Design a protein around this ligand. Structure first.
Ligand SMILES: CCOC(=O)c1cc(Br)c([N+](=O)[O-])o1
Ligand SMILES: [Mn+2]
Ligand SMILES: [Mn+2]
Ligand SMILES: [Zn+2]
Ligand SMILES: [Zn+2]
Length: 145
């Protein structure tokens, strides 16, 4: 393709647990990450949606990370649209998506600069791991948990 994502986590590389949450009534949201080297960031956003905040969190993880990065997301949309764009680049049956295309195309630019990326989906779940902590962080003031 235009790139290849890793098929299993990159051993040794820092992992970013990304998440975003938005509120449909106000279009307010937050995107951010926590990492397994004790890094964290949360941004507040306006005029956004849940899909945009999930994508924005991924963008931030690519922005702030080294050449090799492990990314854990709970958004099937974000993983799919990114993986589809890579797999179907400059190829026959491609028609780029309508929604979020500006955000997705900036993500793709961040991506090909990387050496190696592992991007995986896990369902939102409860507990104390990374997805749980970043969920609470992006959900604060946006959504009851
Ligand atoms: C605010 C609720 O917790 C989350 O951040 C969250 C839940 C779901 Br469900 C998704 N998603 O991308 O499928 O992200
Ligand atoms: Mn999420
Ligand atoms: Mn979540
Ligand atoms: Zn390397
Ligand atoms: Zn977890």
């Amino acid at each position: 393709s235009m790139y290849q994502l890793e098929k299993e986590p990159i051993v040794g590389a820092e992992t970013f647990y990304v998440d975003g949450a938005a509120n449909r009534e106000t279009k307010l949201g937050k995107a951010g990450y926590v990492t397994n080297r004790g890094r964290q960031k949360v941004v507040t956003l306006t005029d956004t949606t849940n899909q945009k905040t999930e994508l924005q969190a991924i963008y931030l993880a690519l922005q702030d990370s080294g050449l090799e990065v492990n990314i854990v997301t709970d958004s099937q949309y974000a993983l799919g649209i990114i993986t589809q764009w890579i797999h179907n680049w400059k190829k026959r049956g491609w028609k780029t998506p309508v929604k979020n295309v500006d955000l997705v195309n900036q993500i793709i630019e961040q991506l090909i600069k990387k050496e190696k990326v592992y991007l995986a989906w896990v369902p939102a779940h409860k507990g104390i791991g990374g997805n749980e902590q970043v969920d609470k962080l992006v959900s604060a003031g946006i959504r009851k948990v």
